[PDB]
Design an enzyme around this catalytic site. Structure first.
Site, PDB file in Angstrom:
ATOM      1  N   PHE A  58      -2.433  -4.393  19.204  1.00 52.24           N
ATOM      2  CA  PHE A  58      -2.609  -5.784  18.786  1.00 52.24           C
ATOM      3  C   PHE A  58      -2.762  -6.731  19.984  1.00 52.24           C
ATOM      4  CE2 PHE A  58      -1.804  -5.926  14.191  1.00 52.24           C
ATOM      5  CZ  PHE A  58      -1.182  -4.700  13.945  1.00 52.24           C
ATOM      6  N   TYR A 100       2.979   1.613  10.463  1.00 51.75           N
ATOM      7  CA  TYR A 100       2.857   2.070   9.089  1.00 51.75           C
ATOM      8  C   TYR A 100       3.160   3.539   8.833  1.00 51.75           C
ATOM      9  CZ  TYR A 100       0.821  -2.567   8.722  1.00 51.75           C
ATOM     10  OH  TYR A 100       0.565  -3.902   8.769  1.00 51.75           O
ATOM     11  N   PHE A 111      -9.316  -3.884  12.595  1.00 47.84           N
ATOM     12  CA  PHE A 111      -9.030  -3.749  11.186  1.00 47.84           C
ATOM     13  C   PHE A 111      -8.557  -5.048  10.568  1.00 47.84           C
ATOM     14  CE2 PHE A 111      -4.425  -3.741  11.062  1.00 47.84           C
ATOM     15  CZ  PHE A 111      -3.967  -3.082  12.193  1.00 47.84           C
ATOM     16  N   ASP A 112      -8.141  -5.991  11.407  1.00 51.46           N
ATOM     17  CA  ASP A 112      -7.639  -7.271  10.912  1.00 51.46           C
ATOM     18  C   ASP A 112      -7.652  -8.275  12.065  1.00 51.46           C
ATOM     19  OD1 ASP A 112      -6.531  -9.125   9.180  1.00 51.46           O
ATOM     20  OD2 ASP A 112      -4.497  -8.309   9.280  1.00 51.46           O
ATOM     21  N   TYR A 115      -3.842 -13.207  16.145  1.00 55.46           N
ATOM     22  CA  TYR A 115      -3.844 -11.799  16.512  1.00 55.46           C
ATOM     23  C   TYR A 115      -5.109 -11.092  16.073  1.00 55.46           C
ATOM     24  CZ  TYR A 115      -3.109 -10.748  11.571  1.00 55.46           C
ATOM     25  OH  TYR A 115      -3.276 -10.669  10.208  1.00 55.46           O
ATOM     26  N   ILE A 167       5.527  -5.666  10.641  1.00 58.42           N
ATOM     27  CA  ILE A 167       5.970  -4.362  11.096  1.00 58.42           C
ATOM     28  C   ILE A 167       7.036  -4.446  12.199  1.00 58.42           C
ATOM     29  CG2 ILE A 167       3.872  -3.193  10.317  1.00 58.42           C
ATOM     30  CD1 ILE A 167       2.876  -3.407  13.225  1.00 58.42           C
TER      31      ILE A 167
HETATM   32  N   LIG Z   1       3.131   2.702   5.081  1.00 57.93           N
END
Ligand SMILES: [N+]
Length: 107
Positions: free
Chosen positions: A99, A82, A36-37, A26, A56
């Site tokens: 994503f 988040y 970010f990742d 991913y 998540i």
């Molecule tokens: N959070």
């Protein structure tokens, strides 16, 4: 909630069930497109067990609608990711995440 858009089809038959381990690649991005990742940058697939809430909510619900071998774009609202607090320093408050996820296999 989470919106799932196909990028490349999977087998269209094998769907993840609660308890199985999903092996995915991913790349996570913020609304603007800022990465970010990414497991792809680490060139090491990510594994998680569905239903164990180790990811998540948007992943729990979105990946369950994907089939083995499929690559899809998941657009996730704050409440399924988040939330209001985000993760200071990495993820802003009330952030909508995108994503690019590929489901490689199930274990
Ligand atoms: N959070």
């Amino acid at each position: 909630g989470v919106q799932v858009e196909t990028i490349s089809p999977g087998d269209g038959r094998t769907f993840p069930k609660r308890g199985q381990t999903c092996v995915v690649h991913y790349t996570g991005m913020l609304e603007d497109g800022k990465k970010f990742d990414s497991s792809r940058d680490r060139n090491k697939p990510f594994k998680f067990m569905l239903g164990k809430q180790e990811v998540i909510r948007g992943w729990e619900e979105g990946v369950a609608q994907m089939s083995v071998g499929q690559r899809a774009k998941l657009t996730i609202s704050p409440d399924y990711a988040y939330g209001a607090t985000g993760h200071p320093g990495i993820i802003p408050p009330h952030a909508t995440l995108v994503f690019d996820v590929e489901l490689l296999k199930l274990e």
